[PDB]
């Protein structure tokens, strides 16, 4: 199923934006 | 083809989650 | 249904391309 | 095509290794 693919294709994608989220803070801890 | 495009949903999945943790000891770590 | 699969794809894969960036700004200054 | 898809996973997956590696290194850089 493509439908499949294409929903754990948003999950990937959740958690590259929430590891963007984590860089953010890392970067500012380091100021 | 889908149980490999399937398959690697999940490596990429599972290094997105090792990822997030590298990130969040060195973030705490970093505190 | 394909459209959107193959953009997210691209969405993915810019992402990653941000997020080896922001790591690799951190590991300069961090040098 | 699923082809396709399969292939641009390969090099999403790909970026995640090395965004492991790049990792690695800033963990040293910070012992």
């Known amino acids: 199923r493509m439908k ?3 929903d754990k ?3 990937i994608l959740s958690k590259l934006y929430h590891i963007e989220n984590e860089l953010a803070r890392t970067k500012k801890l380091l100021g």
């Open 4 to 6: 499949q693919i294409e």
């Open 9 to 11: 294709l948003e999950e």
